[PDB]
Design a binder for this molecule. Structure first.
Ligand SMILES: [Cl-]
Ligand SMILES: [Cl-]
Length: 159
């Protein structure tokens, strides 16, 4: 169990543009593209080819790699995130990276209270706090797996 496998599970794999739980055009392994033609356009530019709304597994895997790298890099460059990340064990690092991949750096950075509790190693409590969020109510099952990972420090939720 690693971040890649962890996210592959949470995001799935879809080779044709599609909308995500939020209405946004997305593709591959949770690769957020955006409206429609505009998204087919975003997609062709991202792949550098005329896609016709569809890509290979290999290209979806390329996006994925780019995406995970971008997230870790974004955490590390972020003032409020970095310190949290550094303070965590390797499993929980995975958990933060998941959230960032999903919701953007910016969005994670607003989980101010949870971020501080994670820092203080207040597990039970951060879990409770993370749950009061729109995030959890919109995608409760994913959210619970990620929250379990932060609570336990194990990969039990993904097995
Ligand atoms: Cl891209
Ligand atoms: Cl879900």
């Amino acid at each position: 169990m690693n971040i890649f496998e962890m996210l592959r599970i949470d995001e799935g794999l879809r080779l044709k543009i599609y909308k995500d739980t939020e209405g946004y055009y997305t593709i591959g392994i949770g690769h957020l593209l955006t409206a429609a033609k505009s998204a087919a356009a975003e997609l062709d530019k991202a792949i550098g080819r005329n896609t016709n709304g569809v890509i290979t597994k290999d290209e979806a895997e390329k996006l994925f790699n780019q995406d995970v790298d971008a997230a870790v890099r974004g955490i590390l460059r972020n003032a409020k995130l970095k310190p949290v990340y550094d303070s965590l064990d390797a499993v929980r690092r995975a958990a933060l990276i998941n959230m960032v991949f999903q919701m953007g750096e910016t969005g994670v950075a607003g989980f101010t209270n949870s971020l501080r509790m994670l820092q203080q190693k207040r597990w039970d409590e951060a879990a409770v706090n993370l749950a009061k969020s729109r995030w959890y109510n919109q995608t409760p099952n994913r959210a619970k797996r990620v929250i379990t990972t932060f609570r336990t420090g194990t990969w039990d939720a993904y097995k």
